[PDB]
Structure 1
């Protein structure tokens, strides 16, 4: 409910501080134990090149 209240105010940077990533990096490894891979890709809006984030 605290996350919802912060989102309702639109305080995006306060929410980021209060959440921080180890929570997501640990999630990827547990999904890997089930033979699933979760890759995070960034597509550049300038040259359309895809970057695989180090997760």
Structure 2
């Protein structure tokens, strides 16, 4: 409903067609902005997910 650009544009379509709406995985813009602002004061924030099954670490953008 607020601030996820890709996701927002899809829901209007699912509804007109009659489909189901998936749960979003990417971050909202609000979060992306914070990272950019911090990277402006020379600090870095990263989000990683560690897979339970194989132990791999993946960096979400």
RMSD of aligned Cα (Å)? 0.4
> Hey, what does 2:48 align to over in structure 1?
41
The size of the alignment, in residue pairs, is: 34
TM-score by length of 2: 0.55
Runs of 4+ in structure 1 off by over 4 angstroms are none
The structure with the largest helix share of the pair is 1
Q: CA deviation at 1:32?
A: 0.2
Deviation by residue 1:3-49 (Cα, 9 ceiling, x = unmatched) = xxxxxxxxxxxxxxxxxx10000000000001000000000000000
The structure with the largest strand share of the pair is 1
Structure 2 stretches of 5 or more lacking a match?
Answer: 1-27
**Which of 6, 10, 30 is 1:23 aligned to?**
30
